[PDB]
Amino acid sequence: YQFFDLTQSFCLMAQEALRRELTDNGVTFIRGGAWNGTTAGLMAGETLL
Amino acid sequence: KIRREAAQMQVEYQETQQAHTQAQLELLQRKFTNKALYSWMRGKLSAIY
Amino acid sequence: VLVISGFAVLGAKNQPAGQHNIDTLFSLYRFHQWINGLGNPGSDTLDMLRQQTLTADRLASVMGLDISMVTQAMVSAGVNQLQCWQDINTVLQWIDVASALHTMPSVIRTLVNIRYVTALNKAESNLPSWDEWQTLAENMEAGLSTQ
Amino acid sequence: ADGNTVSIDPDEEQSTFARSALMRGLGVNSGELYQLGKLAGVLDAQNTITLSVFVISSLYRLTLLARVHQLTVNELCMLYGLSPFNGKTTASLSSGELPRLVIWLYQVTQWLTEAEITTEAIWLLCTPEFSGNISPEISNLLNNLRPSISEDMAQSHNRELQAEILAPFIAATLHLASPDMARYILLWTDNLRPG
Amino acid sequence: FPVMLERTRNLVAQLTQFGTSLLSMAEHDDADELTTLLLQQGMELATQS
């Protein structure tokens, strides 16, 4: 859980870095749902990939 | 008549056999890794793949 | 669902939420047995049980029993809605005692309402009249076999 | 055989002795008697009925028809709804229509027993009706379709391509076998247009 | 962007083998419980025999 939280923060800041580099503020692909709490929050890896 | 009693307790033995096999089935369905989890697996993997 | 409802949709006796004792233990055991017996629509059943949209006719359709049986169970238990599992289990046990005796729920209510006091020493003499006794006997006996 | 009007309403207090006798003879509870009256169409105001030998014979014929096919009153009502003779009363069954109904019921029961399907399940899988509201599976389909796919690529013109795109989601929400089978179920439902 | 790209990717990698390991251990656990229940049922059956 802690590692997934760290990786989610990392991917969000990477998304913001890509937004700055492309000078656009509308593109979003990390839209949550990676932590499916009904199943211990699994299958976040392939979604983030 | 003691033979009859032995036969009847054999009947209750096999009845307990059915009882704990049904218990095995229900606990297997109540296990953690199950059909809902595996359907989540297959669907997410198919789409993301 | 139980914790989200905070034992409000479960009901309690003399305590808010629920104290950890035999009453709540038995209530939870019977509730889990009911959930197990729910069947395939049990998922949706619990779904609107989270809400307050679980209606009497929907419960009748899910359990497969008679809507008039459910209605007479309502009017016998005195509950107008399945606010809590206390009311739900009261209705379920009324249906159970009706079905075990193979007799109508209002007949069960009439049998229970018999204050067999026979000229005081208690609340009152609720003994039915002669024709009422005859009709009640007919209704409670109508569901037997041939032999 | 007196012709007097008695009510078969299960909620009716002070049930008639003749009503109780009919209940015991038919071996069905009062709710099933009401369902039989609904099926026969001989129902009247306040769910009353004239005690006539014709109506008694019709009800007993319905009971025998259920018994010979080993089905209850509710299942009989369901199969009557699913039958081509739906929306008709037992009184409105001609001398040639009754044998047709009998033979149709026999063939249906034989095929159903061969296929090993229950009653309410075959009701649901034969009628085009709905449960009544949004199911948790439909909610999951919404929650997995709105984020994953937006209008950007969903607003295309190729209906078959849209079906291909939506197929894996349908398979996920229906616990189906393959995306192509989900697509083909989508093709059925689109050529049917339920809603 | 690229540096964030690779290390988010590899953090996701460790997340994925963590998920696979937890799934495998859950399967092993439920196998253990099913075998234990089978042994218990066998022992009362032996008692009745």
Across the interface, of B10, B16, B33, the residue whose CB is closest to E27 is: B33
For C21-53, give one letter per residue: b (16+ CB within 10 A) or e: eebbeebeeebeebeeebeebeebbebbbeeee
Q: How many whole angstroms separate alpha carbon A4 and alpha carbon D103?
A: 65
Contact B44 A39 (CB under 8 A): no
Contact C64 D120 (CB under 8 A): yes
- For residue C145, what are the CA distances in angstroms to C104, C141, D186? 16, 10, 52
Rounded (to 5) percent helix, strand, coil in chain A = 55, 5, 40
Chain A residues touching residue D147 (CB < 8 angstroms): 31-33
What does DSSP assign to residue D156?
-
- The separation between CA A48 and the C-alpha centre of its own chain, rounded to angstroms, equals 6
For C119-141, give one letter per residue: b (16+ CB within 10 A) or e: eeeeeeeeeeeeeeeebbeebbe
Across the interface, of B35, B39, B47, the residue whose CB is closest to D168 is: B47
Q: Give residues with Cβ within 8 angstroms of E9, minimum separation 6.
A: A49
What does DSSP assign to residue D6?
E
Tokens coding D75: 């299942």
Identity of the amino acid at C23? D
Chain D residues touching residue A33 (CB < 8 angstroms): 147
Q: Check: CB of residue D158 under 8 Å from CB of residue D195.
A: no
Chain C residues touching residue D13 (CB < 8 angstroms): 106
Query: Which residue is associated with the tokens 């949004």?
Result: D134
* Structure solved via: cryo-EM
Q: Give the dihedral sign, CA D159/D160/D165/D170.
A: positive
- Nearest residue of A to residue D145, measured between CA atoms: A33
Q: Check: CB of residue D43 under 8 Å from CB of residue D81.
A: no
Residue in D134, D118, D136 with CA at minimum distance from that of residue D126 = D118
